[model samples]
Target chain A: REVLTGGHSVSAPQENRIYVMDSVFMHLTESRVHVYDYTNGKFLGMVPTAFNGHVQVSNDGKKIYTMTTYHERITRGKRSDVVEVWDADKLTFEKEISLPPKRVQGLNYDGLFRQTTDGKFIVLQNASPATSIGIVDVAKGDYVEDVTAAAGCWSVIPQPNRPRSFMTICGDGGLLTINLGEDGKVASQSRSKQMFSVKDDPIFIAPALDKDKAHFVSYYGNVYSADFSGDEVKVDGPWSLLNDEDKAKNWVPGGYNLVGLHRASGRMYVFMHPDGKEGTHKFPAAEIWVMDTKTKQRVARIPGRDALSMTIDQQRNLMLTLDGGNVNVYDISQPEPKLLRTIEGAAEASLQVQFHPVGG
Target chain B: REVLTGGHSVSAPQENRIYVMDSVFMHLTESRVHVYDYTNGKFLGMVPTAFNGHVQVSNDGKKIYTMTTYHERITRGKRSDVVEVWDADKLTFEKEISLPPKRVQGLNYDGLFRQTTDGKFIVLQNASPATSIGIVDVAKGDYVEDVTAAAGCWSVIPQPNRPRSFMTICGDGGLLTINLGEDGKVASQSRSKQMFSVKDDPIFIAPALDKDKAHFVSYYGNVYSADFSGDEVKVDGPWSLLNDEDKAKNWVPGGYNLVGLHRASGRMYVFMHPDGKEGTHKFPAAEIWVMDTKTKQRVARIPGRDALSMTIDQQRNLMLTLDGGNVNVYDISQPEPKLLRTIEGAAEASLQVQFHPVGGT
Candidate 1:
């Protein structure tokens, strides 16, 4: 019922084809999506795309979508953003899903084009800490509506639970969950308690996968688990990843692109490093730490090789780690791990990772 | 007779008094220079430099010099570059060494200050792709003279052996070497044959020492070795660091701040990443390949870290790899490498590394 991009997950799963965006958010000019066979681990083919290539596939992995974001002088700061849909089986261009006047959504890391379980509509995040979320009908090929979000809320995550809402984190450390109703318009909105301390701890969001769960890790590894399972939000934690001794040893959570979870298993993973203090949060972690989320205890720490991004698979046992040009597939079933293979030439200076659509 | 920060050297040593500039280039205003004891593994102190914060220390480690460089806002770029010297041991401000009006020199990646063998006169590279070099007499505190260079040569390397000429790599892929006159002023200048190709194989200069060698490596690992040792320049291989297979695999060098050398051992290190393409050269290496300059072969490939800058220590034995926030000290004494320690909290987003001078060699 979901995709497993395991690590750079909008968080995804297995049993299907994995679509890799051979694109960067900053440069946004390369025009292709590299497809790979999800189960067999083989290169499928690549489809040429437009600029700022953020990819989103239909629930059944039958429809492919990409966007064109403009920042050049020609556009007058108007990034004429448009989403292109393709026939997944044929990989042929089908139609254009228009967003707004001079603006579209999903100029983001991943989960740019998010569709819900019922597949009635899809959600898109806007640029400039978007004030609203864009809704598109997959079957009708039309702009359904725009759901207003808290002003300057950065990313849009579609809630898993009912009275479904598009969730975004606010600048003031609160969570904004916008409920959709009355024929799929933004029926209402609400905010959670400030689950984060923006002064000392800043969260790097790994985002939710239809579960209304916002998985977060602070700059120094304080796990802020916010469950937006209801009409409002309830934050379960701002828990410490580093113990008193670990803190005394100057250990801290390092790096952005930080947290990943096998939501079904309640298992969480973070890239971490030791001897961390003021600015070490920016460096790559020396290991991937497995934490038991229910108890808020770090269970395992694997040896790190400067991995930048990570995610789990359909089995919730395989952890794929992206380190620039190298994408290593790991069997993280045990407390220890088994590195199956190091996939080379997977990307060009790419930092983000995701698995593919499966069982949807 | 003098310290040769050749091979893009930020000179530091066993008593590795590593001085880090808290200020970033292209922008300035941080007033402090953080000093760390390398071998002794401690944060020694922070010294207040000036507006620009580009620093230089005496070989004896008794004196520290920093500069204040900027142009007037209303004047539309009237450079008022001032150099202040301080007692390194006491950390007290001592004096200002002045240059000519409107002449901005070396507020860059630690190549601003250059001294002679006898240490009588020091040379400073101009701020812009300099057209000239400013000669400062350390003993007398005087602006000796300005020696003209090839127009738009961005970096300067003092010759290791020669008494007169300074070396620079030009935009059009030529080596520009300028010689001084009988009066120690710009007597004349000339250009060497194309030492590098500005096109597909364009190189980013790691720079040279006070002596004759200008060591360079391209965006990929085409090692460009030059001899500014003479009146004429001799260029060496854009030697493939990649083997036939690697070249076929398209593996390449990448990283903004790169290509560190242990000058004495001729052990060169570069940060590498795999599956490299055109713009990929600008990123960090997945592994650092240690090469032997004499053998022209890569001796070892150390699994990489994202190091922004690296410097070798007192005996050219300790290789210091710098990330933005951490400095990793690797003992490159043998083919099998050993990471001695990771010195943390050195500098935030630091770009250069050097050890305190132990001996010139």
Candidate 2:
């Protein structure tokens, strides 16, 4: 009998589905975003990226978007930067929307590209090494103008309620908000007062974003919460993640994509390393510190396994950590976290993980 | 009609074929050694490596060897390191020989692992972070012993003529040669006086070896030649590769595996960059300087393609550079190096390339 031929489609996102972005920096000629079942660790499918590309999935799980660069001579010559759209179910390329050839070709950080809350535009962080944000009108399939309000800042944090508004973390310890007009151009912009110290303690750019609040963690384990729920940026407590003991021991957060949030439980997981010295910010984690975002206190500490990145599946209440080539999934429902299973070879040199939303 | 199911085998070594090692550092779950035809940029085949492994090909072109590590829990737990043997023709696994779990898991450099001239033993560079040399007998299918005379040195450079002797680059700017007995144990060891300044100009460990001579290039464009054919190592030449004008502009050799020597032509190709500073030693090349090894005079300067690693195919007289994701092959047979072709996506984060021996039967 002839073997049954089926479409190489990714299954619908439910509680068990997650996405793993493998940068494959070693041979970054090609990178990929893989879809896997977190329950049994089954690899469903993957989409390729050029150079060091970033992937953004639709909330409804119906589409996948990738921001990539292409060179005419493979690694040189003329360059073409575009936002490619993919069919989520069929795992097929739909079309590509053109953009200025200046998308930041760095590590696949989530902050570099994000979808607007209204789903009208895709905002991307750009650098020709001067930073700016490029907005693309999604439904119209067009590239909008670059917004210069993000001059010295990085990353795009979209507002949950405000349809046309997004924020970028500035270099001088502040936030810059850009509000777009009905024409999809920058209508107005505002800047917040200094919220944290960049010189003494620099905060990680990819914050753990909730609906209206953004939680940014500093290198010294301080959490800076900013509320983007209003027209003006509202800043709150600069709570310390460690007590006197952890401070004396020099236990600080480390690694890439090191922080994650669970909205329902109001908990945050941070990868931490002890005796952290200067230039040791990229060290693999010694343990993962679990904290109560409401109380701003450390709740539990789990042993680390050299994991550099992590994510939380909101629907399944599972915490997953990218430990080198393996993924360690922990069930976070109980008072103490339980290790459910480890997905080995789930990633190689991977930096970020995102869960496919259940309530799109 | 039934479709013919032929065996998947790699082609024999010839003038136009080259081996590319793609470390794929982004996702290192599986690395590979790729075979490519530089003639028209065809991907011949590939052999896989576990974790950050190193590869060694037999001089006879019949077998392939890879030193790799495996973990019990995939990424953790107990570790098992082995030297796996593969049939070069069939591209199939033959067997694996156990090794002490101390192989240095690093970037794929040519010096970490090498074969002896007698073809009876494979010499390996070991580091549990304390350096040593490992000898594995091919016929016996077992490890012979670990030689500890290589304490403060790195990289293994096998002597082309001396079957049981090999030399290593030491930390104090010297060369340490270890000669093995018939039982594969270290019989004697000797060290040369400081031949190059380690503080001012440190030479790269992976030298361009041709027969009895090993030519090492320093960061600041100086060549230190070591003659290792005799019972003791003889060192000579702190020759400058740059003139006063080039040195005044800070033109220096940079990148990994940045030097190559063609025995037949007595020429050396080096990756050089201008405006070099203290920590800019690993920057991609701005140009490739072709020089005569005998007179230490630069003959030609070719434009660089941001290549980090390079190799020369002596049989074809071609110089190839690993420019990011592509391989740029230049025909070096003429007065000026001509860009024959560029093999796109030939390697991803690759570091080394090796040409198969032509005389091997």
In terms of TM-score, which candidate is strongest? 2
Candidate 2, after superposition: displacement of residue B217 in Å?
Answer: 1.0
lDDT of 1 by residue, A1-360 (tens): 987652222212334455656554322443457666544556666555545466766656667776665332111234446677876766666787777743343323554556655556777766544466677776777888876545667666667565345677788888887766635677778888888888878877665242667678887778787776667888756788888887887777665456677666676778888887777875787888888777888888887678777666645467777766566778767655578776666665455556655546
Candidate 2's residue-wise lDDT over B85-147, tens digit each? 988777777888999999888887788989888777889999998999899988888999888
Tens digits of per-residue lDDT for model 2 on A1-360? 789887655664555677788887765746788888888899988887756779888766678888887653232347778898888778777878988989998886788988777777889999999999998887788888798778889999888778888899898889999998866899998998888888987888867878788898888888998888788998865899999999999998998888888888788888899997788777889998888998888889988898888877676787888865788888988645788888888877688777776667
lDDT per prediction?
A: 0.65, 0.82
- Candidate 2 lDDT score at position B73: 27
Which stretches in model 2 have alpha-carbon errors above 4 Å? Answer: A1-360, B4-6, B11-15
| TM-score (all chains, Cα) for each model | 0.46, 0.54
RMSD of 2: 22.4
Model 1 misses residue B287 by how many Å? 34
Please state the interface RMSD for every predicted structure, separated by commas: 17.0, 13.0
